[PDB]
Structures are given as C-alpha cells and as structure tokens.
Amino acid sequence: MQIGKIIKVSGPLVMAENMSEACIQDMCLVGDLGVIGEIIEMRQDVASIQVYEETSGIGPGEPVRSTGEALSVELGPGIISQMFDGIQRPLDTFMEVTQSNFLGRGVQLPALDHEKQWWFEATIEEGTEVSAGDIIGYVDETKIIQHKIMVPNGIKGTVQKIESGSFTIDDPICVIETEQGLKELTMMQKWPVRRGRPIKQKLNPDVPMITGQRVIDTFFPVTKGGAAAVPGPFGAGKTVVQHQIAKWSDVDLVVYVGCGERGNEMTDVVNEFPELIDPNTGESLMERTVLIANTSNMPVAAREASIYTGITIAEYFRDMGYDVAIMADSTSRWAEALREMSGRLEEMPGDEGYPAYLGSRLAEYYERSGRVIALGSDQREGSITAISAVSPSGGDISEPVTQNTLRVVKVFWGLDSSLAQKRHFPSINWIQSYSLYSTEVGRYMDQILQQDWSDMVTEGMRILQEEEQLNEIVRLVGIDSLSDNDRLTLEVAKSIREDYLQQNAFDDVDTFTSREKQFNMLKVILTFGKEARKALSLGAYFNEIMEGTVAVRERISRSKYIPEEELAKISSINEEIKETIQLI
Amino acid sequence: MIKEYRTIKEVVGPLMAVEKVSGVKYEELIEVRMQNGEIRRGQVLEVQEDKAMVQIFEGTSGICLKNSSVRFLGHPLQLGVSEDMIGRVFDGLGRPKDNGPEILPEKYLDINGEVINPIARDYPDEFIQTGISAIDHLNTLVRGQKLPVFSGSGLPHKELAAQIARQATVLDSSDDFAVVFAAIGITFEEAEFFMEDFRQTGAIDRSVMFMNLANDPAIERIATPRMALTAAEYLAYEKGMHVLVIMTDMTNYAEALREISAARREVPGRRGYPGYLYTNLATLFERAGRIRGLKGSVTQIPILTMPEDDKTHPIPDLTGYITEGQIILTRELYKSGIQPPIDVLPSLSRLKDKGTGAGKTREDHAATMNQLFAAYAQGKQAKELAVVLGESALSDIDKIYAKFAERFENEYVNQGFYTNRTITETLDLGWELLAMLPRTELKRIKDDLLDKYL
Amino acid sequence: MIKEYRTIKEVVGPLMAVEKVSGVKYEELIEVRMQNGEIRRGQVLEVQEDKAMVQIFEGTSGICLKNSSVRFLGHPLQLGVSEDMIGRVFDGLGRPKDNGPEILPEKYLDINGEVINPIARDYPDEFIQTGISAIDHLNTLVRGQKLPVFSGSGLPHKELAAQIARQATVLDSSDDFAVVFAAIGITFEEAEFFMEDFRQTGAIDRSVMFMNLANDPAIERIATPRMALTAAEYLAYEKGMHVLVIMTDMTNYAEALREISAARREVPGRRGYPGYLYTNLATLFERAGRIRGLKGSVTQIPILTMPEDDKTHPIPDLTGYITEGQIILTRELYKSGIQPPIDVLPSLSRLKDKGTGAGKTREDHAATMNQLFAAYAQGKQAKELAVVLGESALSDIDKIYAKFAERFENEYVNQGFYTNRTITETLDLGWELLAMLPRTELKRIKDDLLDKYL
Ligand SMILES: Nc1ncnc2c1ncn2[C@@H]1O[C@H](COP(=O)(O)OP(=O)(O)O)[C@@H](O)[C@H]1O
Ligand SMILES: [Mg+2]
C-alpha cells in the first residue's frame, strides 16, 4: 500500500508527499507516533493534513498512511454512559491501557467494547424485504433505552437468516440477500461525522421541551427539534444552564459536548450524573447520557471533531425514534479552532480572523438538528434539540459567532452581567431575549393544560415591559410621583422577577419546576395583581393593600420551594389572596 | 465533441485547478466525475495558458485526485426554461425537488442573462396596491420596481413578504402575479413558512420555486438568484406574464460571494467583502422593469437581514445604492407589537412620484405623505426629549406631536399581517391622523386640499 | 549523537533559516554559539523538508551566516527538576540566579507538561482559609482551584499577593502550602520587593521562585509560567506536596505574547491580540487541580493589571472565561483607604459549592452568602441615589441598606495587608458586621442562626 512522507510540520497543520492516491476528508496516521489527522487540502502528490493531536516533536521524513476512510464514529451497543474524546476515544479505557493519568498520543483504541457479550432479540421474521432504517431487532443497552439495530444506509434486500442469541458487535447476526449478493450484518455500523445521517424529510418542531427552568419554559421556550443559543459574558451562567437542561429535560437521550472548556466541568458531570437517580424509573442520568470531552488545553483541532462526533451520535439515536438533546459548550471554541487552522492554511479572513466559511459551517450544524422522519417502512419520528453556548468577548454579541448563530436559530437566551452581578439567576435578559416558538408553544400549552396560559404569559411579559418604561421615569423623577396603579405594576413586576424568574440551580427543590407547578405559581402571582387592581378601583389605597398582605405575599415568595407532591399548597394561595384583600 | 480531462492538479476547498487543457473558455460550465460515479458541476473563474481555475458548487469533499475526470461542456451555466416551470419546485441549480417529471425545455438560456437597453426600457408607472399603508402611501411600490426589505434576525420579514405576494394587485384588469421564489441558505422552517402559505392560498399552482437551504452547498447560492431571474425574465418578456420575484436571504448570497473571493485570495474591500460586491449585486437587482411594446413585467422584492442591525454594513448599504428604495424593519417596533414593524423614516421609494397623484391613487397622495412623514419625525424627536429629560420639559406643542407619532405607529403602521387596506382607506386614515395636529402647522399641504378634506 | 549545523542560509529580522538538515523536529530547542563566545537559545518554529525556520530568544543581532554554529538539541524547552529546588531562586528558563550551590537535576521535563485526563481528575472541594473574609465567605478558595486577582496599576495587588501567601492554609490538617512564585516581566525594584519580603518572613525557606525581569527576552517571559508550573506539577504529583502557585504580572505575559506574534507576522485578532490568547492562557491555568490516587495538589492564583481599568479588555476577559472566578480590586475602594480593596459584586468563585457546608460552616455562614450578595446590591443602589439626592425612599427599607454598607466596607471588608483573621472570626465579625439591620431585613430561610448570635 502507498505510504506517504511528511515534508512540512507547522502547528496542527502537516503536509506530506507521496499521497497521490489519497482523498479529501480521509483519515491518515501521521508520523512515527501515528497521530490522528484528516486531509483537508491536496495539491498533486502532497496533501494538507489537519492533526487532532499534539504535533510537537514531529518532523519531515516520517511516514504517513491513509486509512482510506473519513472521520467516522462507531455506532452500536455500548455507546451509552461513555465519556469520549474529541474523536470518540474512551477516556476511561485510555487511562487503563496507557496506565497513565495524562493524555499521551499515537495510541489507537476502538470506541466500543468488541469483546463484551450482548443479548440480541430478533423482532423480524425471515423472508422479509428491508431497506435502510428498518429495525431487525434491539438490545437492552440500559433498562430504559432499547438500542435498536437498524439496517445501514446502502443495504437493500431480503432477510434470509436471523436468530436471537448472545453475540458481540463483530459477530454476524443477520444475513441479507441483496442484488450484489449476500451481506451479513452486525450490531455495529460506522458513519462519517461530517456527513449528516439521511432522513425521509424534516418536520416542524411544535412540541415544547420541559426544561424545568421557569424563565425558559414560560417566556422563551424551545421545542423538541429546536435550536437555542446562549450568548453571554463569562460567569453569566452559560454552563450552568446547559447542565440544568441536560439533567431535567423530558428527552430520551442526552449528548453533552465539552468543547474547549474546563476539565473540572466534565469531571463534575461524569461523577455526579451516575448519582442522580430518577425516582419514577430508577435509572441514573448517566444511563441516558453520552459524553464528549475536549478541554481548552487539549488539541485545538479536536474541538471541531468533538462537535461532529456529538451531533452524529445524536442523529444515530434520532433515527431510532428517540428525542435527543445535544449541548455544545462552547461553540465559540469551535470557531477558534477554525480560525487557528485558517491562519495555518494561509487563508484569507474573514471577520475577526475567522474563516470566510464560518457561517456555512455553523448553518450546516444546526440544520442537522430538528424533528424528522427517520428512514424505514414504519416512518418513525425522531428529533434533535440543539442547545448551544456562545462566548462573546466582553459580552459583545456583535461578534461573528453570535451573529451567524442567531440567523439560523429561533431561540435566543441572552445572558446579562448586571443580572449575574445581582445574583439574578438564570441571567436571561427578559427584555431582549426571544423565542419564535412562543406562539406555537402557546396554543399547545392552552390545549394540554385547558387554561388560558398563552394570555398569562403575554400579561406577565407586558408587566415586565411596562416595568422598564416605569423604571425610566423613576430615574428622572422620584418614585413617589407615580399613580397607585403604576406602583402596583412595579410590585407585581418585582414578584415576577424574584418569585418566578429567579431560580437557584443548587437548591434541592428549586432546581426543577414541573409544568403543572409553573402554572400554579404564575397564576398566583397574577392573581395578586388582579385582586389588588380591583381593590384600588374600589377605594382602597396602595399602601393599605401592601401592609395587609405581608403574610400572603410571603407564601408567594416561598411557593418555589413547595414540594412537587403537594402542589395544592400553592393553589390555596389564590383563595387566601381574594379573602385577605376583600377584608381590606 | 468535447472531452474529459484526468489532469486535475489540486483541490483546495471550493476551488479546483486543472492543467494541460485547451479550448476552455471563461465562465464555462464544467462537470466533475468522481471515482465513485458521483457528478458535481462548476464554472471557470479564470483561465490562462494550459490552466483553468474553477469553483465547485457541491464542494470538493471526498474527491480523489488521481481517479477523477473533468468535462468541459463548451457553454456557460444555463437554465432549461419552459412554461411548465409554473407549479414546480426546483433546487439551487434549477433541478426538480418535488419528485415530478423532468421539464421538457423550450430552450437553454445563460443564467447571467443580458442587460436591458435603457432606450428599450419602459418606465414603471403602474401603482401596486400591497394593502399595507406603510408601503402603499409612504413608500409606494410600482410594477417593475426593485423594492427590497431590510430586516434582521428574529424579525418577521417572512410574514411581510408573504403578505405582499398574497395581497399585491394593480387596480386595472390584470389580477395575476406569477411568483418566482428563490430560497438562499434559509432554514427549513423559514422555507416551510412560504411553502405552507403558497399552498393554502393556491399560489403554489402559479409559482416557480428555486430552493437552496442551509444544509445545501453555499457556493450554489451564487447561481440560485440568476437561475430565478432568468426564469423571471423568460416568463415576462417571452410569455407576457407579470412576474413577482421574492428573494431571501440576500445576505447569504454575499457570504457565499465572499467565500469564493477569499479562496481566490482577492483584495478585500470594506469588512472583507469583495470590491465588486456592488457590481455583482447590481447584475441581479437591475434585472427588473418593463419593456416598450411588451406586456408583462418583472417586479423584485429582495430580502436581506442587516448584520448587527447595522444599515451601514456593506450588504445593506450597497444594496440601497442599487435598489430603488428599501422597506426597513426594526427591533424597536417589533417589540412594540407593530405589524408590520416598518420604520418609515429610513424607508424610501424612488418611483412613488410618477406612480401616484391624480388618475392614480388620489390627488392628495403626495401631500398627505410628506405631511405625515414630517410630523412623525417631529414626534419621535419629542419622545426622545421626553426620555432624556422629564415630561415637564416638553412644551404643549411637543406633547401633541409625541402623541401623534404614538398613534401613527399603533393605528396606521400597525394594521396586521392579514388585513388588506384599500388605497382609499389608507388615505382616509391619513387625514384622521393629521386631524390631531393644528391646521396652522400643516405647512406641506396647500389650502386647496386642506379645505376639501378634513 | 550531537548535531550542529555551521551554515545558515537566511536571516530576516528575528527569523532564521537553516538548510541541509535532517531529523529536526517541531518546537525543538536550539543553541547558537556567537563568534565572541556568547550562546543564544532558540526555538524551531517550522520545518520544511531539509529546512528549519527558527527564532532566537535574544534576537539575531550580530549573527554571521558562515562563522556561526547552530546546535540542535533534539528536545524541546525543558526544566531541570530535583529535591533541592525549595529555597532556591531561578531564572525565566530555570537557571539559578541566587548564587548558591548549583543543583544536579534528577531529570529534565517538557515545560508544556501533559493534559490531565478529565476522568482521572479529582474535583476540588477542600476549603482554604485565606484569612480574608471577602474571599473566605463570598468568593471561597479551594485546593486545586484557579482563582486570579484582577487589579490595576497602583493598586495593592502585590500586598494582597504576599498576604495570601502568608496566612492561607487548609483547615483541620497538618498540610502546609509549598509556594511556587513566578515573577513575569517586572522591573528589578519590583522583583527586589518580593525577594526582600520572602526573606524577612522566612517564606523563601519553603518556596521556589522563578524571577523573570522586564528587559529579559520576550520568549523567556512566555516560558516563565510553564517553567513554574512544571516545577509545581513536579513537587505535587511526584513529591506529594500541595503547591500554591502565584504569578504576576499576567498582563506582561500577554504583551510578550503579542510582541512574539507580530514578530512571526501573525495576523492580530481582537484589539491587536493573538487569536490563540484564550488557548495559550488555557494551557497554563488548566494545569491546576487534583488527581485520583495521587497525593498532593496544584493551586493557582494568577495576578493581572487591567489596562485602563477596563474589564472587557482581552487579557482579563479571556482570563475570566478560563479561570474559576476572579477577585476584583477597584480604585474607588482603595481611595477610601481599604486594604484589600475587594469589590465583592464583580467577584466570583465557581467552586464555592462543595467548599461550603463541608469545611465550613454547615450552612451557618454558607447560607448568608447569597444574602450579603443581594443585600449589598440594593445597599449600593440606595447609597448611590441617597448621596447625590435627598431623603431616601424609606429610612427602614431603603436607607437602612445604606447603613449596612459604609461600615461593612470600612470594617467588614477592610482587614489588613499584614493582618490575618480566622474563618470563625470572620463569621463572628460577619454576624456583627450586619450593623445595623433588624430581623425584618434578613430575609433568609432560617430563624435559627438569627437567634444564636446577634
Ligand atoms: N441558575 C443558577 N443558579 C445558581 N447559580 C448560578 C446559576 N447560573 C450561574 N450561577 C453561578 O454563576 C457562576 C457562573 O457559572 P457558569 O455557568 O460556569 O458561567 P459561564 O458558563 O457563563 O462562564 C457559577 O459559579 C454559579 O455559581
Ligand atoms: Mg462555563
């Protein structure tokens, strides 16, 4: 076989000659160590290679062997509850094999365990004609998640032989009689990460995800198969928001991608998730989660690979008929990696140094997410919800990565430093943030709750918007110059922010809020407003109302800590509000 | 005839270099046969001696250099035009997307088209009633005009464009606009909005779609508009149809144009965009109007999202230098629940004068427009004064204009995305707003009109 | 086999070119022997074929291309480690500068170190009683945490640095911190201040110091943090010590990085700083933490001066994006004679969750942490408008907040540069620092600790 030879080493960019048979996007082993690299450019016999490992100590003369295949992932039983590299390498197995607490290089490791035995339960009869996407059986990878064995893309024929039993992911378990001849199947399939897995068609994401976060699910909701961006300054709460979503969302599987961030943050996830148990089912968080970690001091090029590895794995379970949520923290480091290779390739900027194709790369990523119809005769439904964090410099969201993201996504959670400085968490700016799903979510919520919830969200938002306008007047003239109605509006606005919007993620109860609890909580806050509005019209002053409602408003301020199994203690406030104010 | 070359020299991103060729012409369409049998097309960017530089629409991903050939078809990129295009949906390169039959083309037309002789041009005179007061009255659209919408990310430019194509009509006999839609790097949901709207109104049966989405190649976005405009001019000047062209997003077109110029390592202009950005967009937007002795027309309504909501950005700025006015949406009005959120102060129509007046619309059209505009500008200045300073600082005449601008936005501009106002209803509504102002301050309306109307 | 090439092809500014080489690797360390006996260190930036582009630390001034020798060492920039580094003072490249017995290093280690496997990492949760209540309560430090101090020129961050070094230690443990100090690109008199302080307190007898001066080569200023961290990870992960690393000034490090970047003709990013500033700084701050099954730890406290007191500047901004919190020093507080001038509002700690309630104080003062945050916020908003304008909105609900600030910055936050207080004392003073606010004002979940002490 043809063996190339390095002629140029410059950072993560390596060029090698004697590779005329090499192809674009193909993978190749670079140098003596055999580090992992991908060909991105090629001029005659010499190919430009993007290395996803450290290239220090490597020079010209060393061999380069092309694998003949693109950057791919191993998809099969044993992929869930695993923490992978940027290029899908088991960090736990890496620690065991290399016998080191540090990350070396040039060490090849399969993504899955090809020795472990799995029980394959056949669910299709012989003599049945199948194509791409069709289920031939499943594996109980976890007690909840069934790993459905699907026919790979490009396979088309009749099922000749199939039988249930204990196999590995290498052993043939099914025989397909095709036109080209006979093809035997396994429980594992490989797929290129830069190519999105085929679907029948895309669908409209109209079903709201229950994130458990009140500010999100109420005012700026994201749907199953939707995309949300979280731009903000450092320490605003970007990583915390994605953590809360990855642990509370009503989603089948969670793919968390640690892209160029802190190592302790991935350590915190892989340690606590196995300890967080779902009382209804009993499974831990880690049994529905796949981890991909490439920290900031890990190879920069592998930041890009960590993104494509994560989204492809998400697509794989999406095709099974599962709802999947993928977190990207942070996507700014991805763009930085593109900028790094851009300068190495002697390319042309670009905004702020980024490559000119940055917008295309981003747009192609989010378009791979969404609610779709997976391939197969049954036309099963799958979806990928993309939650991405963006890290602007100085919080300035007019930089390329944020702008190019906001043009393809419909949800925008803009974090604010002044809110974080007031310990107002989450730090979402209710004035500037938005969700273009709010209208469709509104009629969904009205339909499933059988309440005028959409009107409630609009009214609560109007008060917040009217607050800002009133806050302009209090800056020029004293607060004591306002009417009782405006003084009331400010107090209701205070209740919206402090009792509903403010939500500590480190509190046992306040960390999550069910849809039913969100309704009762918002209704109570809005009930006080309407009843106090009636009192003013019936002669009562503003001060007299406030002084005689200290106790009931105190129940309101603590209604966020009310246990989920006793939500009736929240709705009883509505009665107390009417009774106490009527006494005034 | 022509032959295929196995002399590919290098593959660098969207660019390919071929050596040892002959008879290769500038902007010639090529085909790339890969080793797996897959076919990709492209056009020549530069040719010299035995070499040729081409751009590849679908990209160069997965291409093996040694076992791939390149065909030179001996002609530029063309479109098979037919009247059977109507009711069909095509992709970015003009190929069927609706799983229908292959169109039997009447002819093949170079998608760059040709420039209309200024003498042969017929000046756009015919007032188009879009039903939107902020347009029909203040920024009047005329048949054959290029009137774009300047929007931003998150703003309802889709709803606005859909409303126009659904309500646009001349006051004469013809009530038939043929809609040529060109999707450029837009998302699936944005694409589905137009699809569902065209399907429910039945406009899908009399429209032509050229769809290039966000998952589609970016370089295809350069050919997509020319594909649509060639179809537009064909149905208009050879079939006599009144064509309405909707294009979005125009910003995505410039980004693709910037990718090629960056890959070719050209000398950038302002903010990295090519020096020929103005001229390149001009070859698109100038493709509109009427022709003497010919019925039918081409009316363009391009859509672009202003980066960082900045009008001074090269993409909206150079567009304004090309197009005949612009309809601008702002976030301040969208947050105020104004539908459509049109800010008329930076808005413009360069063909409104000779499209309105007596005989077309009504005699008071020009006067009411200038008076409403000036008063609105004065009121907005008064509201800003009420923001930085107190309400007490405002004079009695300041509060009146400030309240005028407030009701002007709430009742006049804000009409709804599904409400169709007639031109008479608009002009009558204009007088009811001017009634809020003192008669002495109406210094843009002569006594003749001032006595006749309220 | 010792390698040395005696023919230099090309010298363009600070860059060099050596031909006819083989076996030369990327980032390889080299030495150039001048004709006057001088030896200069260099670094291989890039290698093509039989050529190697290298950069010399001390510059290429006075270098001949025929009468010089370039020795390729066959290894990157290293550090000589040993048991006898404690009590010694080193260079920016690890060379002795205290004129004591030169040490024979056990081995040489790559100053780039290696990336800790995130699975092998041990999350920091052991509380460090720095003594400073502004830190200990509200922005709590933990062993293994990277917590920097953001200051400005003229502010006492050097006094705060020495203070923390003096009095910081772990509770209920015999563990004593081994301090690795790294001076980066500072003047002689600045460096002499630390040398003097470490000797008087006797801190030198338990420390390793890497002194890099301002007129030292820019590459050496860049190498200094990696030299110190390699020594830190050595003493921790091989000797089992709990190492406290202190670096200053990081602003100088960034400026040196910017100079080197321009010399290599790299296109500047935001505000003229390199595109890899985030990545580069991340290869330093991520070196902190703990490891499973290994005794010892690495704690970092970076120090930097914010240019023009601007926090949005690339240097403190990208630092804030990497590190686990930040300690802010403002002139407004320092003008009030406050030492340390710590502003708790822009300050933060990301690892204060497991540090609190475990080492201290079972929610005794872990709980009030979010109150003093939220109460001082309104206490500042009140004090802002009540000072410039008249009577506050309330003397019980709005001016009561003003009472809880002035003294709780002159006392609660004051402390002292050579003054040390225990955490118990801090939680003691803290309950007394609420002076004076009634039980109506403390809106916390508990009524228990409101009764135990005043
Ligand atoms: N929802 C929340 N509840 C409580 N504290 C929060 C919340 N979000 C952020 N914080 C606090 O703010 C800090 C910033 O967290 P992080 O998400 O890491 O910031 P970013 O990701 O924006 O850099 C954390 O240390 C945490 O203590
Ligand atoms: Mg973070």
Curated annotation (Swiss-Prot), chain A:
Report any one BP term from Gene Ontology: proton motive force-driven plasma membrane ATP synthesis
The UniProt entry's GO CC annotations, sorted and at most eight, read: proton-transporting ATP synthase complex
Q: What is this protein called?
A: V-type sodium ATPase catalytic subunit A
The Swiss-Prot or TrEMBL record describes its family as follows:
Belongs to the ATPase alpha/beta chains family.
According to its UniProt record, what is one Pfam family this protein matches?
A: ATP-synt_ab_N
Conditions for induction: By increasing intracellular Na(+) concentration.
Task: Offer an example of a GO molecular function term for this protein.
Answer: sodium-transporting ATPase activity, rotational mechanism
EC number(s) stated in the UniProt entry for this protein: 7.2.2.1
Q: Carries keyword Translocase?
A: yes
Report residues binding ATP.
Answer: 232-239
Task: Tell me which positions the record assigns to the signal sequence.
Answer: none
NCBIfam families, sorted: PRK04192.1
What are the alphabetically sorted keywords of the record? Answer: ATP-binding, Ion transport, Nucleotide-binding, Sodium, Sodium transport, Translocase, Transport
Give the function comment from the record.
Involved in ATP-driven sodium extrusion.
Statement: the UniProt record of this protein carries the keyword Ligase: no
| PANTHER family, per database record | H(+)-TRANSPORTING TWO-SECTOR ATPASE (PTHR43607:SF1), V-TYPE PROTON ATPASE CATALYTIC SUBUNIT A (PTHR43607)
Which InterPro entries does this one have? ATP-synt_VA_C, ATP-synth_a_Xtn, ATP_synth_asu-like_sf, ATPase_a/bsu_AS, ATPase_F1/V1/A1_a/bsu_N, ATPase_F1/V1/A1_a/bsu_N_sf, ATPase_F1/V1/A1_a/bsu_nucl-bd, ATPase_F1/V1_b/a_C
Q: Which reaction does it catalyse?
A: 4 Na(+)(in) + ATP + H2O = 4 Na(+)(out) + ADP + phosphate + H(+)
UniProtKB/Swiss-Prot annotation, chains B, C:
Upregulation details from the record are: By increasing intracellular Na(+) concentration.
Q: Which Pfam families match?
A: ATP-synt_ab (PF00006), ATP-synt_ab_N (PF02874), ATP-synt_VA_C (PF22919)
Q: Name one GO biological process term.
A: proton motive force-driven plasma membrane ATP synthesis
Answer whether the UniProt record assigns the keyword Nucleus to this protein: no
Q: Does the keyword Glycoprotein apply?
A: no
Superkingdom to which the source organism belongs = Bacteria
Q: Name one GO molecular function term.
A: ATP binding
Coiled coil region boundaries: none
Q: Give UniProt keywords alphabetically.
A: Ion transport, Sodium, Sodium transport, Transport
Q: What does this protein do?
A: Involved in ATP-driven sodium extrusion.
- Supply the HAMAP family for this chain: ATP_synth_B_arch
Q: Which family does it belong to?
A: Belongs to the ATPase alpha/beta chains family.
Kindly provide the name given to this protein in its UniProt entry.
V-type sodium ATPase subunit B
Per the UniProt record, the source organism is: Enterococcus hirae (strain ATCC 9790 / DSM 20160 / JCM 8729 / LMG 6399 / NBRC 3181 / NCIMB 6459 / NCDO 1258 / NCTC 12367 / WDCM 00089 / R)
Organism ancestry: Bacteria, Bacillati, Bacillota, Bacilli, Lactobacillales
